[PDB]
Each structure stands twice: as structure tokens, then as C-alpha cells.
RNA sequence: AAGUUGGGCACUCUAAGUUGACUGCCGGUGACAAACCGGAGGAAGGUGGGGAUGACGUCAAAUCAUCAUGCCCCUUAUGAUUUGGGCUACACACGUGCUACAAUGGACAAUACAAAGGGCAGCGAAACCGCGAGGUCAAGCAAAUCCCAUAAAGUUGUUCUCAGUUCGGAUUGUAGUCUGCAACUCGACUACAUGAAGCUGGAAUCGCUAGUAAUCGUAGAUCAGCAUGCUACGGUGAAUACGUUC
RNA sequence: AGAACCUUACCAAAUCUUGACAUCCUUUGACAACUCUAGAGAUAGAGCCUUCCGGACAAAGUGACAGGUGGUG
């Protein structure tokens, strides 16, 4: 009975600080926590022509990189479940909890 | 794009194949990205302003 | 339709126009913008005025023309 | 046990090498080196560290290698075997270092540049 | 000699059969399989019984004059009906929708600067 | 407009014959990075040369290269006879051997290479002719040696 | 020829103005943000807004408005901010929460300077004087350096030209340096005039 | 059957935080200099490789067709809507590519080794059917899990045997598949047949200094379908650089 | 960074003139997803018939006005 938390954010600093908070809250509730295991980063690269008309050779490359973190709550305790749902993370981070 | 063309793209076509994408900011027919729904010029402008989440200049 | 499972494609207006003309021997010209429509066996003996993009050009179906589109027998471009 | 372990990376290939007292037989992915690798030249490369330290025939090499191709994987083994030899004896460093076996080859594929056909290759230019 | 054509004696029969109009590599392999004649045997080393066996099978396929005549009629039909394709056959321009601003040399013949 | 000389790359000895030169020959034979075909051709050629010659393949190869390699060459500056460097001598020898082998009429490269290496040992190959021609033109320009 | 200073440093030293994560509905959220940003710009033209930061969480939009004049946007009794919120709520189904942050120094802000110089030019103010006053006020406030440029038919001249003035240091090539850049347009009778301001406040 | 699970986190990897390269140390040289050459140690040595980043200016250089805008012009029309056609024309000239001219190859068979990406109504396995392109049914999978997706060159055999061929694959006939509202003009792909030029290219001209060139496959954006283009990816992997007169 | 339609602008034919599109103003309440007929379709005419909160939103008429990938880089 492991509660799995998946975190995805565009910035790692937010994801790491969020990871620390979620792990702590569960550990404070006394649930065993393993992680936060870092999932391989996903990067999407967009190549666009820099100019408005012609000039194909000049290109600009942009990237959007999603940082992923996996957290597993080994032992489910009533306090932990409520606390994990209760935790308010920064706006950037996206959290998915599988119980 | 002309106002009528932008209007016609928005209107439901007789067939699905007839439907086409335009840049939502400016209505440019070509080079419209699906994820952002923006043309190449508009995408660049907004990325520079930091108004597209997560998008930054790429170097490697 | 090229796939066999789908039948040969004909525009309903074209087919219906031909089917109405079946009864009378003295057939009259059928004006069509349907270059895409297939020539069915039923079409034999009919003259279709198919649009070339500027004018409707008289096309008279013969046995050999069956299976080919109406557009095939009316040119869209002019050279020399 | 008496197992000496070293990791070798070449190009996009990585090799986990285990050196144990043996007859000098090499097994890669549970297959003979000669079966695994196409050319005998490749075999000469991976047995080079043994020659420098004169430890030929002392160790049987068991290798788990992933990534890259036959040359990369073969030369990945060479780096790993040498790294394992250092674990076996610290004295061998001088000999191994002089051969340049200890160095990890930093050469890697250069990215394609935008506006170029390749990393460096340029489109055919015509004035006029 | 098969289907009115003196096929090359020296070559293997799999290849020699392809010197007949209407027979290619795929067909030749089928005809030998039906006749149960080996592909490897050279025509010079073919046997009379084997040759007859091959001849029976090749008679099954439309070849040489029979095929040539059919192909010509289809093209003649297109030209007569005044099909787009037929008209291009008459003009000696690409029939299958290839661009003619450049190239089209196989159909147009050599350059006439 | 150049800073200076660049250090040259080095080759491991050939496994079969334990010669650095053999490795370099494979590199000249190789096309499009296809090492294996190049190695295959060379090793097969060395078998054929030994078979026909009845002498060690490396011996005849060494004898062949010695005949092909040129002591002097003309350089445009009037063409001036100049001494070929030891490293350049090998490059020209290997290049000429492979190129002239490719121009031979034998169906397979291995036979062409063996016929060339044998001929060069007898000092009779097209590559040998290339050296002789190079030496001739160098001697003609002896006055401009200075 | 020159990279946008903000664009180069976005995601390095400068955070994204938009702060939300989406996958399936990224396009929809972006376009909702774009309509909100446009509405605020038109609604608060009189108010001096440096930038708007949008955060999306729990089906709620959190808007942070950095304004030189906090009073105008908020309203005397907070009526104006509520009105803006209600208008935003009509535009967006999600609940909208607006936070107003005052800017202590309007002169140190590039957008506010750029908009000010544009507005003066529309009033037929001399292009030279307007830039010079802007650089002086910024330097008195302790900015490490400021650059100001106006481009177009500056004096109603038939041939357009760009004039720029600089003080202190503006290290565009230095990634560490946080440089505030903004462009504004002056809709003069002769044509559009473009004003760009680069401000280097300096480390802390 | 199988990392498959039981177990472990050793290793590998993943990705956060740190350590490392700075001429720091030691020899010479040099102006008591900056630098230079060589050495030690180090995974890496002299701005280690590559990228981003492009001063003041030049070309009244490109873009009023992304957008915006001064002025000008049209306004029962220079605005608007629909169906069809064109943008795909073809005596020719040019640029950039693709594929070849074979034996360092072609065909056939058996057998290995990547990286970097994409996916929700989307990727679609396995199985069955079709020569195949595909079809049917349908598992898993919003992703380090499932799927795209077996890399290919390669290696080992068998065969062909130097010619317009068992090279090459244009063209054309016919019979199909798929997408789509609909493949006539004008799609992609398949099967069978057909089987062009081409025998390595005049004058001339281009790219590249190493994981590069060359070569081999792989992926993505756009996208119903449609890539020899573009942007990325790894595999194999060279030759040469005396030198600065031109 | 995807021309069969669409895109698309260009051409031809068939059509419209507060207009495909915006704001305001006056008036009304469902405005229609739907079916049938004639049309190449646009569209028109018959059906219907449903929805709507001071007061939302959407129609009808007219005028203020719209529209231009027209020109000048
Ligand atoms: Mg075109
Ligand atoms: Mg200009
Ligand atoms: Zn746009």
C-alpha cells in the first residue's frame, strides 16, 4: 500500500522545494517516504526562423523542459493522507497523488 | 490576415478537412504551432517577454 | 472512391439528374460543375456540360468513357 | 571473490567490467568477445592494458556493455579494464597512464548546426 | 526457346526467363516453382522434359506479342476517348502528373535548347 | 596565415602482421568508414601475394613500398626538386599503391592489390612508374635545386 | 542585430511572468492569459503598470499587478480593484484574484520611463530633452546605468532616424546583470515613433 | 521464455547539490614584466569540445503580405460569399538536392550493436487474414512502465562474374491499399509487368582540419493524407596541414 | 514547420451591399441543433419549436460605421 506522488514543473527549484515539503509533511505524519527519486527530464525544442520574411538560415532555438520527481509514501497513515492533500505547493508545480 | 478570413476560419466548415489553423494572436496562416496555438513570430515575442510558461532560449 | 469497399463516387445531383433523364429517349444536356464524379454505365449516351473553370464544355459519354471521371474529358489548361 | 570492478565510457557506450583471476578469457553480455565484436583489431585494443602491465592471462574479463556500437563498446571495455587494473594494483598507474589508457576519450558526436547540413558541412555555395 | 524467344543459354533459368516480355523476376520464380524446375540449372544444362514443363507454365501467362498488343490497345483507347492521359500520350508529355517546367526528359526526349 | 604544425595521429600495429604500415594501408583502402571491407581486402591480398610469391607477405609488401616511395619530388615555387620527408615518403608510397591497384584490370580489388604489390616488388608496377616519372621530372629540374 | 535583453535572461536570471503548468490545455490557458493581459493594459492605461504576473492554481487565477500608482487601480474604497476583478471574472470563468504591488521608483522602471517618454513625444515634446531628463532622474535614483533610444521621424522629418543617450554602464552581454528593458510606441501625426529603455539597477 | 519475480540498490542510470582546470605547481626563456616553451599531476591543460551571446556603423539592403502605422486610394466595390479552375502550365536557361553509372557491388539467407524524440482520443502490441501496401479484433499506455520501434551500415555464408548486365530504376500499362467530402486536373503507398538515360562527367566550381569529412540509418515540427526539404540523433569513421610566395 | 477542397490571395461563373467582422442605437424574445424542397454550393422557401437570467445573451431595421494580403519598406 504505497502512496505515489508524481511532481512535474518547468523549473527544478520549485519542484525540489515542493518535493522537500511533501516528503517532510508525510514523514512528520510518521509515514515512511522513499525519495524524492528524480525522473528523467523531458525537453521539447522548438526551432523557428528568426526573421519575418525570408532568411531561412538564421534560426532561433527555444526549449521547454519539464522536471519530474517521484515520491512514494511506503506506509499509509490517516494523518498522512489528509496532510498530503492539505499541502499547498507553489503555482508552477503540478502534483499527482496515487493512493 | 483579413478580418473575413479570420472569421471564416472560426466558422464551422461543411467538412472537417476544410478546417484550418491560424495564429490566434495575429491570424497568420502559416507556421502555427499546435501546443501554443501561435505563429513563429508571435511565439518568439511572447517567449522573450516571459509570457509563455517554461519556454526559454535553447543552447547545447 | 479508389478503395473498392467504397463504391465509385458520384455527386447525388449528377446521378439524380441522369436518372430522371432515363425515361425519355430525347436526352437533353446536363450542366455540371462535378469534375470529380465517376462516369457510370447509366451515363452512356448523355452529354454533360462540364465546367472547365471558365466555361461548360460539352462532353458526350461513350462506352469507353465509363470508369473515368467527367473532369478527365474537359481540359482546364490551354497550351499552343 | 577477488573481483576488481571498473567502468569505461566511450562515445555513447558504457561498460561495467569485472576482473577476476582466470585464464584471460573475455565474456561480453554472456557471449565470447570474438563472437561479440566483428574485428580482431578491436580485440587488440581491449587487450592493450594487459600488455602494458604484463598482466596478460592473469584475469578473466566479464563485461556488461550498453550503448554505442562495436568500436565504442570495445574501447569502452579498454577503459574499464585499465580502471580495474588500477584497483588490482596501484603500482600499475604509471604504465597505464603513459599508454593513455586511463584517460576517458572526451570525443563525442558534434551536434548539427542550424543553417548547416551537418556539424561542419556547409551547403554548396554559388556566387551568381 | 520459350514463348517464341531464344532465351540466353549460359545464364541460370531464373534469370533467363526474364528475357521474355511479360515475365519478370517474380513471375519467373513462380513458373519454375509450378514446373518444379530448379532456378540454379543453366539453360544449356536444362533437360528436354524440364523444358516442356516450363513451356506448359509459360503458356499460362500472357507474354510477348499477346501482352504488347493488349498494352497498346489500352493506350490507343485513352487517346481515342480524348482522356487527359490519352492526350498527354499524344503530346509525349508526362502522363502521371509529374511537373514539366523542369525534367520530363524520358518522355520529352533529348534537350532542344 | 597559419600558426604552426599540428601533431599527427598515431595507429596501433596490425594484429595479423604487427606492422603500423599495414594499418595505414587499410585506412587508404577504406571508403566511407567501412573498415571491415578494407581489412578483408588487405588480408586476402596478403594471402594471395604470399601464395604466388612463396615469400612472407610483409617481406614483399616492404620490398614493394621501398620501390614506390620517392626520395625527390618537384614543387612549384619554377619547379624545384625537394627531398620528400620520411612521413611524406610513406604517404605517397601507400597512396600510389592503392590508386594504381584500383586502375588495374583484375575483377576483384584483392587480386589487383596483390598483382600491384608483386609487380612493385619486381619494380614493374604502375605505382613504380609513377615514382620513376616523379624522379625523372625532379632530375630535369636539378638546375633549380639551389 | 541585438537580442531582446529580457528574452536572453528569461529562465536564467529572470522568472517567467506566467507561472503555471499545463499540458492538454496549455494553449487555452495561454490564450486566456493573453486576453486578460490585454484587458488589464486597456483598463489600467491611466495607472502606471510595470508588469503583470499571472499564476494559475486550483481553478483560480492570481494576478499580481506592479503599478507606480497603487491608489488609482485599487480605488478609494477598493471599489476600482473590485470592478476590475468583476470584469475579469466575466472574461474568465475561473475566479480572479488581483494583487496590487506599488513601485517605489517609477524612474528606475524601464516600462514606466518608456511609456512616459512616448506620451511626452505624442504631446510634441522634444525627443532630446525627454531622453536626457529620463537618464538624469534614473542616475539620481542610483541606477548603475541607463540607455534610452527614440527612433522614427523624430522632428516630423521626411527621413527617419534613431537617437540614443546613455549614462553609466549597461552590460548587455553579461548574463548575470539584470537589465530592465521595455519598448513603447508614440503615435505621432507624422508616424509611429519607437522608444526603447535599458535600465541596469545593479546588484542589490 | 525473459529483471520475470522474491530480494537488493552493489553496479549502471536518472538529476539535484557539490569537487575539478586557475597557467594553479615545477623546470627553463623573457625586460626583476606580460607572456612563451616543456614537464608533473589530473578524466580533462592552457579561452578542454560545441552552443547561446553579434559594438559604433554599412548596404535609403528585406519585410506596409505576421503585426502596427503617416499619408494616399477604393467603398451597391480595390469590400463580401459559394462552386470550379489556377498557384502543379513547358520549345528552354540557371540554383539547390535525390538516385545511379556495380564486384570496396547486386540478390538471397542467417546473425549483432544506438542515440535523440513523439503519443488521448492519440501511440496502438499480440493474434488472425492478405504476396504486399493494409484490414479485423483488441492488450497496454497521459509515459524511465505501454506503444511508435526489429536501427542501418555491420558480421558470417550462398550465388551471380564484368555487361548496359542478376548494374541502374526513369517511364508506361494494369490491378489494388489508405486518408479524405472528394485523389480528373493534382496525394502517398503496394503488387505484377514494363525496363530510359547513365560506362563516373567540357570549360568551370563547392564543402570540410577529427569524432570532422565521407557514409549508414533514426526521430521531430507542420500534418486528414502528403518530404529527395528543414531541424535534431547516434553508428562506422578516415586523408592531410611542409608552409605562407601566391 | 505540409497548395486535392480549405489554405488562397489569383482567375471564371453564380451572388450581396451597415455588409463575412466590431461598437453603439431602436425594437423583440427564444436564435435554433434539427429535419424536407429547389439549388454546384452560397442560399432561399416550407416545417417547426425546443432555450432566456432588473437582466442577462441572441435576432430585425436603419444610420453612425465596418472592410481592403489595395499603394508607398
Ligand atoms: Mg509555388
Ligand atoms: Mg529598406
Ligand atoms: Zn501570430
For chain D, the domains span: 2-126
**Which residues share a beta bridge with G168?**
G145
Min Cα–Cα distance to chain F from D34, Å: 14
Closest-approach residue (CA) in chain D for A60: D114
Burial class, G100, CB count within 10 angstroms (exposed 0-12 / middle 13-18 / buried 19+)? buried
Q: Where are the alpha helices (DSSP H) in D37-69?
A: 40-46, 48-53
**How far, in Å, is the centroid of ligand 2 from the Cα of G160?**
11
Check B58 against A48: CB less than 8 A apart: no
Render F19-87 in DSSP notation, one character per residue: -HHHHHHHHHH--TT-HHHHHHHHHHHHHHHHHHH-S-HHHHHHHHHHHHS-SEEEEE--EEEEEPPHH
- H or E segment to which residue A21 belongs: helix A12-28
Count of CB atoms within 10 A of residue A9's CB? 27
Phi, psi of G199 (to 5 degrees): -125, 125
Q: Count other Cβ atoms within 10 Å, centred on residue B43.
A: 24
Phi-psi region of G58 (alpha: psi -120 to 50; beta: other; left: phi over 0): left
Overall size of chain C counted in residues: 80
Q: Is D107 on the interface with F (CB under 8 A)?
A: no
Identify whether the C-beta of residue E50 lies closer than 8 Å to the C-beta of residue E36.
no
The residue among G104, G126, G145 that closes a domain is G104
Instruction: Supply the DSSP string of B1-60, one letter for each residue.
Output: --HHHHHHHHSPPSSSTT-----TTT--SSSEETTTTEEHHHHHHHHHTT-STTEEE---
Residue G7 included in any domain: no
> Closest-lying ligand to the alpha carbon of G160?
2
G-chain CB neighbours of A9 within 8 Å are 21
Give chain C's domain count. 1
Rounded distance between C-alpha atoms, residue C38 and residue A80, angstroms: 70
Evaluate whether A7 touches A19 at the Cβ level (below 8 Å).
yes
Q: How far is the CA of E62 from the C1' of H168 (A)?
A: 27
Distance of CA D82 to the CA centre of its chain: 9
Question: For the purposes of burial, counting CB atoms within 10 Å of the CB of B11, is it exposed (0-12), middle (13-18) or buried (19 or more)?
Answer: exposed
For strand I, the positions having any atom within 7 A of a protein Cβ are 1-9, 11-13, 20-21, 39-42, 57, 66-69
Is the Cα torsion angle G117, G121, G124, G127 positive or negative in sign?
positive
Helix axes F57-68 and F126-140, enclosed angle (nearest 10): 30
Alpha carbon distance E24, E17 (integer Å): 8
CA dist., res. D43 & res. D33, Å (int): 8
Report the alpha-carbon distance of residue G104 to residue G102 in Å, rounded. 6
Binding residues of B for Zn(2+): 23, 26, 39, 42
Question: At E42, phi and psi to the nearest 5?
Answer: -80, 155
CA distance B38 to A56: 19
Contact at CB, B34 and G27, closer than 8 angstroms: yes
Q: Count CB-CB contacts under 10 A for residue D117.
A: 11
Nucleotides of H under 7 A from a protein CB: 11-17, 41-44, 48-58, 60, 62-63, 65-71, 79-97, 103-105, 112-121, 142-144, 151-156, 159-162, 166, 170-174, 176-188, 191-197, 205-216, 220-224, 230-245
In a domain, G198, yes or no: yes
Longest dimension (CA), chain D: 73
Q: Is D84 buried (19+), middle (13-18) or exposed (0-12) by CB count in 10 A?
A: buried
Whole-number Å distance between alpha carbons of F66 and F86: 12
Q: Please say whether the beta carbons of A71 and A19 come within 8 A.
A: yes
Q: Which residues contact B26 (CB under 8 A, 6 or more apart)?
A: B1, B39, B41, B42
- Other CB atoms within 10 A of residue C56 CB: 16
Q: Are G198 and G28 in contact (CB under 8 A)?
A: no
- On chain E, the residues whose CB falls within 8 A of the CB of C75 are 84, 87
CA of C13 to the centre of ligand 2 (A): 55
- Asked whether D84 and D41 are in contact (CB, 8 A), the reply is no
* Chain-chain contact of D115 with A56 (C-beta, under 8 angstroms): yes
Distances (CA, A) of F73 to F85, F87, F99, F143: 10, 14, 18, 14
The 3-state DSSP class for residue D91 equals helix
Tell me the angle at which helices F109-121 and F35-53 cross, rounded to the nearest 10 degrees.
50
State the DSSP code for E72. Answer: H
Nucleotide with minimal C1' distance from the CA of C71 is: H184
Contacts of F50 (CB under 8 A, 6+ apart): F56, F57, F60
G53: CA distance to ligand 2 center in Å?
37
CA distance G119 to A74: 62
Domain for residue G9, yes or no?
no
Strand I contact at CB of residue B18, distance < 7 A: yes
Disruptive mutation site among C60, C73, C80 for chain E (greatest number of E CBs within 10 Å)? C73
Helical H runs in D11-116? 33-36, 40-46, 48-53, 70-88, 93-99
Residues in F touching D45 (Cβ below 8 Å): 12
Cis peptide bond upstream of E7, omega within 30: no
Instruction: Assess if residue G1 is contained within a domain.
Output: no
Return all residues near G10 (Cβ < 8 A) that are at least 6 apart: B47, B48, B49, B50, B56, B57, G16
Distance of alpha carbon B33 from alpha carbon F122, whole angstroms: 71
Q: Answer whether B54 sits within 8 Å of G37, measured CB to CB.
A: no
Which DSSP symbol is given to E12? Answer: B
How far is F65 from F97, CA to CA, in rounded Å? Answer: 8
- Rounded CA separation E69/E63 (Å): 10
Q: Are D82 and D102 in contact (CB under 8 A)?
A: yes
SS3 state of residue A34: strand
Would G32 be classed as within a structural domain? yes
- Indicate if CB(C13) is under 7 A from strand I: yes
Q: Are strands A59-73 and A33-49 parallel, antiparallel or unpaired?
A: antiparallel
Do residue C64 and residue E85 have CB atoms under 8 angstroms apart? no
Decide: helix, strand or coil at residue G107. Answer: coil
Chain F contact for D102 (CB, 8 A cutoff): no
Residue of B nearest to A66 (CA): B54
Domain boundary among G104, G132, G155: G104
Tell if the CB–CB gap between E85 and C73 is shorter than 8 Å: no
Tell me, yes or no, whether C12 lies in a domain.
Answer: yes
- CA→C1' distance for F32 and H215 (Å): 4
Q: Do B55 and A46 touch (CB under 8 A)?
A: yes
At how many Å resolution was this determined? Answer: 2.2
* Distance in Å from the first CA to the final CA of chain F: 26
Name the nt closest to C33 by C-alpha to C1'.
Answer: I40
**From CA C40, how far away is CA A78, in angstroms rounded?**
75
Task: Residue D48: list chain F partners with CB under 8 A.
Answer: 12
Selected residue of D111, D112, D113, D114 to mutate for chain A interface (largest A Cβ count, 10 A): D114
| B17: CB within 7 A of chain I nucleic strand | yes
Of D118, D110, D18, D3, residue with least CA distance to D64: D18
Q: What are the backbone dihedrals phi and psi of residue G48, each rounded to the nearest 5 degrees, phi first?
A: -95, 100
Query: Using the CB atom, is residue B5 less than 7 Å from strand I?
Result: yes
For residues G16 and B51, the answer to whether their CB atoms sit within 8 Å is yes
- Give D97 CA → H24 C1' in Å: 22
Query: Residue G30's domain spans which residues?
Result: 15-104
C3 part of a folded domain: no
- Provide the shortest C-alpha distance from residue F127 to chain D (in Å): 28
CA dist G92 and G37 (Å) reads 12
CB nearest A62 (choices: B31, B41, B58): B58
CA–CA distance, G204 with G198 (Å, rounded to integer): 17
Strand duo G95-102 + G60-67: pairing: parallel
Is G4 a member of any domain? no
Task: State the chains in contact with D (3 or more Cβ–Cβ pairs under 8 Å).
Answer: A, F
Q: Report the alpha-carbon distance of residue G80 to residue G67 in Å, rounded.
A: 14
By residue range, what is the domain housing residue C53?
8-79
What's the half-sphere exposure (Cβ side, CA atoms, 13 Å) at B59? 5
CB burial of residue D102 (10 Å; 0-12, 13-18, 19+): middle
CB proximity list for E28: less than 8 A, separation 6 or greater: E14, E15, E17, E18
Extract long-range pairs of A82-86: CB within 8 Å, 24+ residues apart.
A83/A25, A83/A26, A83/A28, A83/A29, A84/A3, A84/A5, A84/A22, A84/A25, A84/A26, A86/A25
d(CA D83, CA G78): 71
The DSSP output letter for G14 is B
Task: In whole angstroms, give the CA distance from residue B43 to residue B40.
Answer: 5
Amino acid at each position: 500500500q504505497k502512496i505515489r506522488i508524481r511532481l512535474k514543473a518547468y523549473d527544478h527549484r520549485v519542484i525540489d522545494q515542493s518535493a522537500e515539503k511533501i516528503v517532510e509533511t508525510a514523514k512528520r505524519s510518521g509515514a515512511d517516504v522513499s525519495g524524492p527519486i528524480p525522473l528523467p527530464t523531458e525537453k521539447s525544442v522548438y526551432t523557428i526562423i528568426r526573421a519575418v520574411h525570408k532568411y531561412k538560415d538564421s534560426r532561433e532555438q527555444f526549449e521547454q523542459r519539464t522536471h519530474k520527481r517521484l515520491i512514494d509514501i511506503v506506509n499509509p497513515t490517516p494523518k498522512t493522507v489528509d496532510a498530503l492533500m492539505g499541502l499547498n505547493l507553489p503555482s508552477g508545480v503540478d502534483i499527482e497523488i496515487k493512493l | 490576415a483579413k478580418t473575413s478570413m479570420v472569421a471564416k476560419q472560426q466558422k464551422k466548415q461543411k467538412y472537417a478537412v476544410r478546417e484550418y489553423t491560424r495564429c490566434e494572436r495575429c491570424g497568420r496562416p502559416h507556421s502555427v504551432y499546435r501546443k501554443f496555438k501561435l505563429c513563429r513570430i508571435c511565439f518568439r515575442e511572447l517567449a522573450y517577454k516571459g509570457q509563455i510558461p517554461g519556454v526559454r532560449k535553447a543552447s547545447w | 472512391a479508389r478503395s473498392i469497399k467504397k463504391g465509385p463516387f458520384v455527386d447525388e445531383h449528377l446521378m439524380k439528374k441522369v436518372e430522371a433523364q432515363e425515361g425519355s429517349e430525347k436526352k437533353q444536356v446536363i450542366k455540371t460543375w462535378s469534375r470529380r464524379s465517376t462516369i457510370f454505365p447509366n451515363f452512356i449516351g448523355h452529354t454533360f456540360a462540364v465546367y472547365d473553370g471558365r466555361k461548360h464544355v460539352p462532353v458526350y459519354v461513350t462506352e469507353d468513357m465509363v470508369g473515368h471521371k467527367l473532369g478527365e474529358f474537359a481540359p482546364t489548361r490551354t497550351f499552343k | 571473490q577477488v573481483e576488481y570492478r571498473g567502468t569505461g565510457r566511450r562515445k555513447n557506450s558504457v561498460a561495467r567490467v569485472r576482473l577476476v583471476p582466470g585464464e584471460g578469457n573475455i565474456t561480453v553480455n554472456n557471449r565470447d568477445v570474438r563472437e561479440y565484436l566483428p574485428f580482431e583489431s578491436l580485440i587488440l585494443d581491449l587487450n592493450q592494458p594487459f600488455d602494458v602491465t604484463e598482466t596478460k592471462g592473469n584475469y578473466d574479463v566479464l563485461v556488461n556493455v550498453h550503448g554505442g556500437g562495436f568500436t565504442g563498446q570495445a574501447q569502452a571495455i579498454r577503459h574499464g579494464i585499465a580502471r580495474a587494473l588500477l584497483e588490482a594494483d596501484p603500482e600499475y598507474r604509471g604504465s597505464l597512464k603513459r599508454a593513455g589508457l586511463l584517460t576517458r576519450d572526451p570525443r563525442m558526436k558534434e551536434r548539427k548546426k542550424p543553417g548547416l547540413k551537418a556539424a561542419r558541412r556547409s551547403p554548396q555555395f554559388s556566387k551568381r | 526457346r520459350i514463348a517464341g524467344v531464344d532465351i540466353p543459354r549460359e545464364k541460370r533459368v531464373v534469370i533467363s526467363l526474364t528475357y521474355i516480355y511479360g515475365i519478370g523476376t517474380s513471375t519467373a520464380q513462380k513458373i519454375l516453382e509450378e514446373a518444379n524446375v530448379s532456378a540454379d540449372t543453366r539453360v544449356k544444362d536444362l533437360t528436354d522434359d524440364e523444358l516442356g514443363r516450363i513451356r506448359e507454365v509459360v503458356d499460362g501467362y500472357k507474354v510477348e506479342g499477346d501482352l504488347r498488343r493488349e498494352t497498346n490497345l489500352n493506350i490507343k483507347r485513352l487517346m481515342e476517348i480524348s482522356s487527359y492521359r490519352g492526350i498527354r500520350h499524344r503530346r509525349g508529355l508526362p502522363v502521371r502528373g509529374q511537373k514539366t517546367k523542369n525534367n520530363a526528359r524520358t518522355r520529352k526526349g533529348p534537350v532542344k535548347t | 596565415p597559419r600558426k604552426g604544425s599540428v601533431p599527427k595521429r598515431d595507429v596501433l600495429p596490425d594484429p595479423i602482421h604487427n606492422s603500423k604500415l599495414v594499418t595505414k594501408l587499410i585506412n587508404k583502402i577504406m571508403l566511407d568508414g567501412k573498415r571491415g571491407t578494407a581489412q578483408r581486402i588487405l588480408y586476402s591480398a596478403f594471402d594471395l601475394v604470399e601464395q604466388r610469391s612463396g615469400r612472407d607477405a610483409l617481406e614483399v609488401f616492404e620490398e614493394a613500398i621501398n620501390n614506390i616511395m620517392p626520395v625527390l619530388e618537384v614543387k612549384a615555387r619554377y619547379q624545384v626538386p625537394v627531398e620528400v620527408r620520411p612521413e611524406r615518403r610513406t604517404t605517397l608510397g601507400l597512396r600510389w599503391l592503392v590508386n594504381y591497384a584500383r586502375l588495374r584490370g583484375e575483377k576483384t580489388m584483392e587480386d589487383r592489390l596483390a598483382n600491384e604489390i608483386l609487380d612493385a616488388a619486381n619494380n614493374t608496377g604502375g605505382a613504380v612508374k609513377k615514382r620513376e616519372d616523379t624522379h625523372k621530372m625532379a632530375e630535369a629540374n636539378k638546375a633549380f635545386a639551389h | 542585430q541585438k537580442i531582446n535583453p529580457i528574452g536572453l535572461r528569461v529562465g536564467i536570471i529572470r522568472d517567467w511572468e506566467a507561472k503555471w503548468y499545463a499540458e492538454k490545455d496549455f494553449a487555452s490557458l495561454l490564450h486566456e492569459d493573453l486576453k486578460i493581459r490585454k484587458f488589464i493594459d486597456n483598463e489600467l492605461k491611466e495607472a502606471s503598470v510595470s508588469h503583470v504576473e499571472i499564476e494559475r492554481a486550483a481553478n483560480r487565477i492570481n494576478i499580481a499587478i506592479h503599478t507606480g500608482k497603487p491608489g488609482m487601480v485599487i480605488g478609494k474604497g477598493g471599489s476600482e480593484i473590485e470592478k476590475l476583478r468583476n470584469k475579469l471574472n466575466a472574461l474568465t470563468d475561473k475566479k480572479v484574484h488581483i494583487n496590487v504591488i506599488e513601485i517605489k521608483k517609477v524612474d528606475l522602471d524601464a516600462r514606466l520611463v518608456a511609456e512616459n517618454i512616448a506620451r511626452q513625444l505624442e504631446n510634441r515634446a522634444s525627443f532630446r530633452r525627454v531622453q536626457k531628463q529620463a537618464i538624469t532622474r534614473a542616475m539620481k535614483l542610483g541606477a548603475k546605468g541607463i540607455k534610452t533610444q527614440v527612433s522614427g521621424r523624430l522632428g516630423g522629418a521626411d527621413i527617419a532616424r534613431a537617437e540614443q543617450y546613455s549614462e553609466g554602464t549597461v552590460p548587455l552581454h553579461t548574463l548575470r546583470a539584470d537589465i530592465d528593458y521595455a519598448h513603447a510606441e508614440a503615435d505621432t501625426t507624422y508616424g509611429k515613433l519607437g522608444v526603447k529603455v535599458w535600465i541596469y539597477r545593479g546588484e542589490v
